[PDB]
Structures are given as C-alpha cells and as structure tokens.
Amino acid sequence: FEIATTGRPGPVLVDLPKDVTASILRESIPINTTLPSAVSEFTSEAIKRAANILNKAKKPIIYAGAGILNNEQGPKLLKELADKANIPVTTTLQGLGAFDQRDPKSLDMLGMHGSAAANTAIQNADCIIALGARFDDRVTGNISKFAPEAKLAASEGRGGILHFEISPKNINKVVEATEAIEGDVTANLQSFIPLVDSIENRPEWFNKINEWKKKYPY
C-alpha cells in the first residue's frame, strides 16, 4: 500500500501461497508491521531560481498534467499561480479537469490531437511551467523541434522549462529541465507562488493567445 500510493502512484502485486493464507500465526510480530504509516536545501534553492526565471518571462505558459490531481489542493494552487502571474493554462489528456476550461486563460488540451492554439502557444512560449506532466510523445510532437522559444530563452538566461516532478526518473528524461523541482507539485507550489511576482496584464502575449484561440477552434 505504501509503495503503490507514494512517489508516482502505480501498481504492486502481492503473491499469496495457499498454505500461507491457510496457516495460522503462532508467534508475536513487530507491532509496527500491524499498522499502516521538510523540503531539502537543494530543492528550496531550485524553487527560488525557478521563481526568478518566471518573473522574467514575457510569454509564460502552464503545462499541467495528472500529477496536479494527486493532491486535493492541486487544482486550487494551479489556479492561484495562473491568476497571480497571469498565465495561460494547457493540460494533457490526463490533466483534463484540473483547470476550469471556461476560464479565459484556458488553452484546452495540447498534443497530437490537442488544440492548435495550445500547440502554437507552447511552441512560442519563453517559459514553460510543467506541473505533474511527463512530456509524453503524444504531447511533444517531434522532440528536437519541441518548445523552440523556451530553449532559446533558457540559453539566453531569460526563461526555459520549469519541471515540477515527483519521480526522478521522469526528470530530464525527454527534455532538459532548466530547473527541476523534485517532490509533490502541490506542496512545492505552496513555496513557489509567494516568490512569484503578481502580474496584472500581458497585453501582447494574451493578444496572440486570443487570436490563436479564435482561428483554431475544434
């Protein structure tokens, strides 16, 4: 139960021999086995650096996935970040419902069969905030051609990819993260958001986004 529900959740199997389940316990066992069950300095610095990067961004976008759903406060904090820094939000297939699609900031689903508005936005963003999503090949398109503007921004020290991910295996697996924030995305968002500058308007960026949404309906 512990392994199944911690880190990235997943399946576990327990094999039960018939003679074991039929047998009777004849001895005492450690009482800790009869019962079910701070942020690192390194991650804290990563978060501060990530905040500074976002505070420079002129064309940010949130790329949110299933990971944000693994905490009850997930969607709430996603919305709080998007509202505070004025950021458009796109989600994966598995992230659908994490963000209210009736919100003007919603770019709908991205990917192979996602909105062309969302796909255009992520290809032109200078800062990508990846929240509990693993850059699957249904989402990225041609990997070498993925997120050109964010990669340029990273190289020029004015943006890049900020990856909030709980599983080390999925950090820098597909694309290089400019800053990797390891751990539960929701918990790390609580530390992240107060370091993020509040922003009232992004006239040019949201002008483009509204234009794209207009020309790319389903």
Ligand X SMILES: Cc1cc2nc3c(=O)[nH]c(=O)nc-3n(C[C@H](O)[C@H](O)[C@H](O)COP(=O)(O)OP(=O)(O)OC[C@H]3O[C@@H](n4cnc5c(N)ncnc54)[C@H](O)[C@@H]3O)c2cc1C
Ligand Y SMILES: COC(=O)c1ccccc1S(=O)(=O)NC(=O)Nc1nc(C)cc(C)n1
Binding residues for FAD: 8, 66, 70, 92-93, 110, 113, 134, 136, 138, 165, 170, 184-185
Q: Which of 12, 15, 18, 217 binds ligand Y (CB under 6 A)?
A: 18
Closest approach of a second copy to the CB of residue 103, in Å: 29
Q: Which of 137, 176, 204, 211 binds ligand Y (CB under 6 A)?
A: 137
* Alpha carbon separation from 7 to 93, 163, 181, 182 (Å, rounded): 21, 15, 14, 10
Residue 87 and residue 25: Cα distance in Å, rounded? 58
Binding-site size, ligand X (CB under 6 A): 29
Q: By rule CB under 6 A, what string of x and - marks binding of each residue 12-51 to ligand X?
A: ----------------------------------------
Residue 170 and residue 102: Cα distance in Å, rounded? 31
Q: Which of 59, 134, 202, 213 binds a second copy (CB under 8 A)?
A: 134
In one-letter notation, the amino acid at residue 137 is D
Spell out the long-range contacts of 33-36 with Cβ–Cβ below 8 A and sequence spacing 24 or more. Answer: 36/1, 36/2
Residue 207 and residue 212: Cα distance in Å, rounded? 9
Residue 71 and residue 184: Cα distance in Å, rounded? 8
For binding to a second copy (CB under 8 A), which residues are involved? 26-27, 30-33, 35, 38, 134, 136-138, 144, 148, 151-152, 154-156, 168, 173-174, 176
Binding region for ligand Y (CB under 6 A): 18, 137
